[PDB]
Amino acid sequence: ASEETLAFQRQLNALIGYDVTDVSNVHDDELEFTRRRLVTPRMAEVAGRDPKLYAMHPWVTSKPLPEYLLKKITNNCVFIVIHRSTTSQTIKVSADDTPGTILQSFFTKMADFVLRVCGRDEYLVGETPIKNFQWVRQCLKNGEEIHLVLDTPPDPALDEVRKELWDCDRKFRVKIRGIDIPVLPRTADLTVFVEANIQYGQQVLCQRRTSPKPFTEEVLWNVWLEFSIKIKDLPKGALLNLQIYCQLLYYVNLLLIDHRFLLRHGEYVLHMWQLSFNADKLTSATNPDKENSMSISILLDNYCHPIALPKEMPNQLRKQLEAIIATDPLNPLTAEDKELLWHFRYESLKDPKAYPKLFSSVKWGQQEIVAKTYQLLAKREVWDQSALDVGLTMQLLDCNFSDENVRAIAVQKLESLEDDDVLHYLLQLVQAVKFEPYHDSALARFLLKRGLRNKRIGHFLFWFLRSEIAQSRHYQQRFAVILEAYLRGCGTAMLHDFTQQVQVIDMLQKVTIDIKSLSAEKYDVSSQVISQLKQKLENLQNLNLPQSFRVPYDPGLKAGALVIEKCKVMASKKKPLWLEFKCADPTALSNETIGIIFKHGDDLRQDMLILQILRIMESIWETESLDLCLLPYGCISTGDKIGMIEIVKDATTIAKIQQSTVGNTGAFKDEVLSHWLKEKCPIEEKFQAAVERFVYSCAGYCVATFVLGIGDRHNDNIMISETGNLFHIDFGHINKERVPFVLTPDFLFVMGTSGKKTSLHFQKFQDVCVKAYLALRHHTNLLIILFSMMLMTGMPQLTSKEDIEYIRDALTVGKSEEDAKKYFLDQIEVCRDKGWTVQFNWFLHLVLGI
Ligand SMILES: O=c1cc(N2CCOCC2)oc2c(-c3ccccc3)cccc12
Numbered sequence: 001a002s003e004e005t006l007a008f009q010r011q012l013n014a015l016i017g018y019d020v021t022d023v024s025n026v027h028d029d030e031l032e033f034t035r036r037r038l039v040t041p042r043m044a045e046v047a048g049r050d051p052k053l054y055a056m057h058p059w060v061t062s063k064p065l066p067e068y069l070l071k072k073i074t075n076n077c078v079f080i081v082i083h084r085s086t087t088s089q090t091i092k093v094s095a096d097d098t099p100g101t102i103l104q105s106f107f108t109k110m111a112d113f114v115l116r117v118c119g120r121d122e123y124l125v126g127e128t129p130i131k132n133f134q135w136v137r138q139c140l141k142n143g144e145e146i147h148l149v150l151d152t153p154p155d156p157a158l159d160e161v162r163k164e165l166w167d168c169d170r171k172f173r174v175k176i177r178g179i180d181i182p183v184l185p186r187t188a189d190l191t192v193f194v195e196a197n198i199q200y201g202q203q204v205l206c207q208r209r210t211s212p213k214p215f216t217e218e219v220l221w222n223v224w225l226e227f228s229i230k231i232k233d234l235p236k237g238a239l240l241n242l243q244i245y246c247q248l249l250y251y252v253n254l255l256l257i258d259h260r261f262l263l264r265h266g267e268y269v270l271h272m273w274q275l276s277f278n279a280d281k282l283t284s285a286t287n288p289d290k291e292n293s294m295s296i297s298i299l300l301d302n303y304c305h306p307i308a309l310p311k312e313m314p315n316q317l318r319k320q321l322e323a324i325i326a327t328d329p330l331n332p333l334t335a336e337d338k339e340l341l342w343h344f345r346y347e348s349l350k351d352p353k354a355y356p357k358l359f360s361s362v363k364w365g366q367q368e369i370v371a372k373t374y375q376l377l378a379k380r381e382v383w384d385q386s387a388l389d390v391g392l393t394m395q396l397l398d399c400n401f402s403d404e405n406v407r408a409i410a411v412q413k414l415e416s417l418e419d420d421d422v423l424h425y426l427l428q429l430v431q432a433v434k435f436e437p438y439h440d441s442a443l444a445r446f447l448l449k450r451g452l453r454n455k456r457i458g459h460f461l462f463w464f465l466r467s468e469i470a471q472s473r474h475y476q477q478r479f480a481v482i483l484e485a486y487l488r489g490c491g492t493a494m495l496h497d498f499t500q501q502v503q504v505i506d507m508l509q510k511v512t513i514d515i516k517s518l519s520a521e522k523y524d525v526s527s528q529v530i531s532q533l534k535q536k537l538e539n540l541q542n543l544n545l546p547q548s549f550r551v552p553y554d555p556g557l558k559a560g561a562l563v564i565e566k567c568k569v570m571a572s573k574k575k576p577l578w579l580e581f582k583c584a585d586p587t588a589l590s591n592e593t594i595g596i597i598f599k600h601g602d603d604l605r606q607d608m609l610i611l612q613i614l615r616i617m618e619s620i621w622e623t624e625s626l627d628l629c630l631l632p633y634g635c636i637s638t639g640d641k642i643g644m645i646e647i648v649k650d651a652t653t654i655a656k657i658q659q660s661t662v663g664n665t666g667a668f669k670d671e672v673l674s675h676w677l678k679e680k681c682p683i684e685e686k687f688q689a690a691v692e693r694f695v696y697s698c699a700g701y702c703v704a705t706f707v708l709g710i711g712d713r714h715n716d717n718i719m720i721s722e723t724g725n726l727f728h729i730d731f732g733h734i735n736k737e738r739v740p741f742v743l744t745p746d747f748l749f750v751m752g753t754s755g756k757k758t759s760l761h762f763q764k765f766q767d768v769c770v771k772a773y774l775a776l777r778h779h780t781n782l783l784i785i786l787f788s789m790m791l792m793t794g795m796p797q798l799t800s801k802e803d804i805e806y807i808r809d810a811l812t813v814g815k816s817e818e819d820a821k822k823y824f825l826d827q828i829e830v831c832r833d834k835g836w837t838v839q840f841n842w843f844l845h846l847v848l849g850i
Contacts, residue, residue, distance in 0.1 A: 008162065012487055015498055017470045018480040025288040027268055030259050031481055034439040038485035041445045043164065045452040046489045051156030055493075056114070056123040057455035059134045061420045065095075067625030072140050078130065080146040082106070083118060083587075095131040099124045118147045119588030120556040125153075134420070141627065149587045159491030166232045166367060168306050172198070173226035176210055177297035179219055179244060179272075190215035190246050194296070196225050197241040198234075198256075198365075201402040202282070205229055205238070205365040215246060233367045236261065236308055237402040237437035239284070242270070242296055250274055250294045253284050259438055263306040271295045273474070277798035278791075279434040282399065283474040311374050313347060321347070325354040328813050329395060329784040330805055333361060345376050352386040356395040359406050370403075377405055388416045390425060391782035397432040397443060398789060404442075411442035419454045424619055426457065427612045428786060430464045431793040439478045448482065452489045459555045461486060462498055467605060467637040500546040505638055507545055508577070511536050512598040512642065516575040525571045533577075534564050548584040551594060553634025553646055559594050560584035566593065574601030578647070595647025602732030604643035607635045609794045610708070610731045613786060617704050617776065624775035628700025628768070629693060631727040650722035652676075655715035658746070666843045668836050670754075673720070673746040680722045690724030694750055695761050697726040699768040702741040706827065707776060707783065709806050710734045711741030714842040718742060739838045743831035756832060766825055773824045780811050 013019045020035065065073070079092045080102075091109065093102060099115055102124075115124045117135055124133050131137070139146045176194045184190075193212040198205040208225040236257050244250045250272035256264050271287040272294045273280070287293040321344060324337060333341065338361035341348060348358045363369045396410035414422075414429070422429075426447075433444055451458040465483045469476040487495060515536070518529050541562055551557040559581040566580040576599035583594060614632040621628060634646030654673070661672040677694070681687045697720075705711040705728060713734060720726045726747075752759025776783065787807040791799040812820045844850045 005163075011499075012484055015487060015495075015502055016480045016483045017466060018476050020477075020480045020484050025271075025286055025290075025477075027254075027270070027286065028258060030255075030284075030439055031477055033259050034444075034478075034481050035484065037440050038445070038448060038481070039164070039488075041448055042452065042485050042489040045449050046161050049453050051159060052153070053126060054453075054455065055154045055156040055159055056125050058123060058126045058128075059420075059456060060126065060128050060132045061134060061137075062132065062418055063420075063622075065131055065137075066622050066627075068627045069137060069140055072143070073131075078136070078140075078146070080130075080148060082115070083147060083149045083589075093130070096129045098127060099130065102130065112152075113150050114153045115148045116151055116587075117556075118149050119583055119585045119590065121550075121558065121585075122556050123153075124148065147589050151587075158493040161489055161491060164488075165307050165309060168231045168303070170231060171226055172206075172229055172231055172234065173224055173301060174240060175224045175299040176221050176242075177267075177299065178221055179250075179294060179296045181217060181294040182292060184215060184217060188215075192219060192244055192246050192249075194221065195243045195245065196227075197243070198227055198229055199239040199241045199253075200235060200237065200364050201360070202399045204241075229365055230367075231263065231306060233365055234263075234308070235364045235367075235370055235402075236404060238364075239282075239402075239437070240264075242272075242298070244272070244294070244296075248275055251281060252286060252296060253282065255284055255437060257308050259440065261308045261310065263300075263303075263308070265300040265302050268298045268300070269295055270298070275798075276796065277800065278795065279399070279431075279793040280472075280474040282435065284437070285474055285477055288473060311371065313344065324357060325351055327357070328808060329356070329781055329788070330801075330808050333357065337361070345372075349376060349379075350382050352383055352389065352392060355383070355409075356392070356400075359396070359403075360400055364403065374405060377409065380409065383409060384412075386413075388413050390417075390421070391779065391785060394425075394428065394432070394782075394785045394789070397429075397435060398785065399435045399792060401435075402437050404437075407436070408442045411446050414446055419450070419457060422450050422454075422457055423460065424612075424616055426460055427464055427609060428789055430461065430468075431609075431789060433478065433482070434475055434793055439481060444478075444482050448485055451486050455490075455494065456555060458486065458490050458494065459550075462490075463552055463636050467608070467639075467643070470639045471605070471637070497550050500549040501552055503546050504549045505552075505644070507540050508579070508598055509639065509642060511540075512577050513600050515569055515577065516600055520575065523571055523573060523575070525569055525575075529569060533569055534567060537562055537564050537567060551596065551634070551646075552636045552638075552644060557594060558584035559596075563593050570597075574599055576600075576645075580647075592649065595649065597645040597647055598642070599645065600642045602730065603641060603796070604635060604637040604645075604732075606733070606794055607645075607731040608637050608643075609790050610710075611635055613708065613783075613790070614704055616782075616786070620779050620782075621772055621775050624778065626768075626772055626775055627696065628703070628772055629697040629725055630700045630704065631697070631721075631725055633727070633729075648719070648721060648727070651719050651727075652721075653716050654718045654720060654726075654746075657720070658715065666840050668744075668746065668839065670745040670749045674750045677720075677722075677724060677750070686723075690722075691750060691761065692764075693724030694720070694726055694747075695764050696768060697724070698743075698747055698751075699765050700772065701726060701728055702743060702828075703769055703772045703776065703824075706741045706773075706824075707807065707810050708787070709810065712739050712838065713742065714846055715742075715744075715839050716846075737834065737838055737841055739831055739834050740827035741831065742839075743828060744839055745835050748832070766828060769828065770821050770824050774817060774821065777811055777817075777820060780813055783807060783811065 009021060073095055076094045076096060077092055078095050079090055081088060081090045102115065116122065122135055136146060174196055176196065179194065191212045192215045194210045196208050206227040206229050208227060210221045210223050213219055234256055238256045240254045240256050242252050252270040252272040254270065258264060271290050273287050321340065324341060341358055341361040348354045362373050393410040393413050397407055401407055429447060436443055447461055451461040465479045469479045515529065515533055519526060548558055548560050551559050561582050563580045563582060568578050570576050570578050576597050579596050579598065580593040611632040614630050618628065618630050631648060633648055635643065637643040657676050658668050658672050661675060662669050677690055678687060681690050717730050718728055748762060751761040751765055753762040784807055788804045791803055812823050
């Protein structure tokens with residue numbers, strides 16, 4: 001109430017990018033209600049987290065040491081280098097030593113502090129073997145030395161937190177007064193009607209319409225729509241989905257039972273959303289644009305105040321039930337399916353992998369059945385004792401499930417995840433909040449909790465939520481609330497860092513878009529815009545631009561001043577900015593700059609989402625002991641059609657390589673690529689390792705790009721580094737010739753296949769591909785749900801079942817390893833037939849605008 005907290009709220013909203021306090025666009029107090037109930041889990045988390053380990057955010061894994069890593073360590077002994085002001089000595093110890101033992105034994109080698117990584121804010125502290133430290137492992141895989149500088153621990157005082165019924169059997173019914181819209185489309189003579197639906201888990205319980213009338217600024221009806229489902233049957237989380245067809249054009253939703261288990265009555269003037277299926281169609285939020293959006297007026301039974309108060313087998317038949325429990329996640333169920341599935345509730349409760357199927361066979365539209373379902377969840381021994389399955393858990397948090405308890409059990413198994421895992425899945429869990437029927441939920445609380453309990457998670461949770469608040473008006477309110485609750489308990493240091501980051505970004509957002517303004521339809525990096533570019537950075541770098549700030553996609557990296565010289569404007573289409581900074585950390589064991597790219601034009605949430613499935617993929621290969629050398633570079637969506645991207649050093653586009661050894665034409669030489677790498681690394685040893693890198697990097701992207709359904713793209717959207725690593729890029733948007741994945745002649749060439757014959761490295765390729773293509777099939781269900789969620793919360797279009805199903809054909813579900821093994825190796829053949837065919841077509845399409 002004072003001026004203190006008042007100003008505090010002011011800045012909080014500036015970091016969120018939305019005024020959470022705002023109450024102009026709401027028909028109830030669910031938001032504020034949610035802000036208050038979060039205050040508890042927040043404070044409860046702040047108090048329970050050790051200030052020390054928290055301030056140092058140790059990054060560890062309790063997973064085994066992979067086969068490819070176990071291969072490098074020589075008899076439980078690793079070499080590390082410790083630094084201290086010019087002084088540098090190497091000490092080899094067992095991979096099982098504790099960071100304390102590394103110090104205790106240190107003091108007794110040469111005649112209070114902590115071991116940090118040189119150039120990064122990464123501390124190796126805690127009761128864990130040095131082998132369980134991600135950094136340590138990263139160095140091993142890349143075959144790099146482990147240089148650590150001994151300095152003083154960060155004062156855990158910098159993370160200080162500031163001062164703090166079922167008897168109304170009457171049928172349900174709702175009256176539609178009329179829809180209103182200030183202006184209508186040019187093409188007149190239209191017909192429209194209101195379709196009122198009783199939704200739940202995306203399935204329709206009941207449906208009613210109105211008499212189709214001509215389309216005009218005002219279209220009254222004053223018609224009562226009486227449904228069938230009794231008020232006693234309305235389940236918590238049911239939505240009254242009101243829609244309008246002309247084709248569906250506008251839609252709006254409203255929870256029938258509020259956050260207090262009360263019914264909904266009274267008059268309502270809901271401002272609808274327009275349609276350009278997907279997460280947005282499910283939002284309870286109303287459209288803020290009240291001066292241009294279509295509105296609708298309704299009325300709910302002005303009754304009293306109802307309150308939904310809180311609560312042997314024929315062997316052969318079995319074989320039938322099982323055939324369902326073993327059915328892929330995409331194949332729907334039939335009448336008999338659910339009926340047969342339901343009847344044997346307790347028998348289907350013995351196998352976890354059946355829950356998704358079982359719970360979707362429930363008639364939530366019947367109060368009786370719901371009550372029984374909960375009786376089932378009473379004895380969850382079989383579930384609570386089951387081993388966590390992220391795949392399965394996810395399946396319960398999608399659009400198909402709107403029941404609190406059901407979803408709550410999924411969230412309940414997530415609690416079992418260690419910080420390392422929470423980070424692999426963070427993006428998808430954050431996107432899953434969109435399927436929650438209320439703003440306050442088990443999942444919303446779980447993200448808050450885990451964010452406040454670890455700085456890394458908290459860091460990415462900030463950015464992920466922030467991207468949705470800045471771009472999504474459908475969910476920003478709910479997300480603005482979840483963020484606030486996080487910024488109110490992350491500490492004063494993090495609160496400060498986020499400020500520096502937001503500041504730097506906002507200042508670079510202006511340039512990025514102000515520079516693109518000059519020439520857009522014709523890529524011509526003017527000689528004047530070059531001087532005008534460096535010049536703008538000059539104004540910013542004056543004293544308003546934060547000297548130092550953490551790189552959003554790589555929190556451990558601290559960026560300093562801008563190396564204005566190396567900064568430029570890429571001669572691309574959307575004219576992105578190529579910036580470079582110095583590493584703010586003076587203990588950095590190098591001088592290399594930090595490259596960051598700012599682009600406008602492409603939706604960077606897609607790239608974000610895509611790069612994340614990749615991380616998961618690499619992780620999956622880790623379990624099956626495999627390394628494909630993917631390079632999922634950092635990418636963060638910051639706002640509408642804009643964000644940053646990590647810059648991979650010593651890397652070039654595969655097209656530019658052909659456009660230099662040949663020219664700006666479509667004639668592609670097969671030996672060009674190899675000639676490039678050879679002259680890049682004269683040292684035979686490097687070239688010998690660079691060629692093998694390609695073999696793996698190339699294979700790795702071929703499988704991932706295929707399963708994801710994005711293997712067919714131009715040559716310019718693909719890169720290779722001077723170390724031989726090939727990696728795809730720019731995932732903005734993605735009768736004729738087609739190809740499964742890019743495996744051009746110049747690639748095969750570098751593998752030995754100078755023509756259409758087998759080779760040494762080439763055989764290694766096919767061996768690794770198939771090998772990785774199988775490692776992913778073991779996680780078919782996990783990929784299905786991910787690919788499925790990604791399309792519902794990452795694609796502007798109204799993706800359908802046909803869209804998701806592709807993932808099922810790519811993974812060849814229902815087949816044996818043999819059939820699948822050959823299937824993949826044949827796709828590799830489809831590429832051997834096209835050769836340069838496809839690439840040449842992409843050249844005619846993009847370059848020649850044909
Ligand atoms: O999204 C993108 C990611 C990248 N990357 C990935 C990380 O390392 C640096 C290159 O590069 C892009 C380029 C580009 C810049 C310089 C040279 C060639 C191409 C043009 C347009 C979009 C992207």
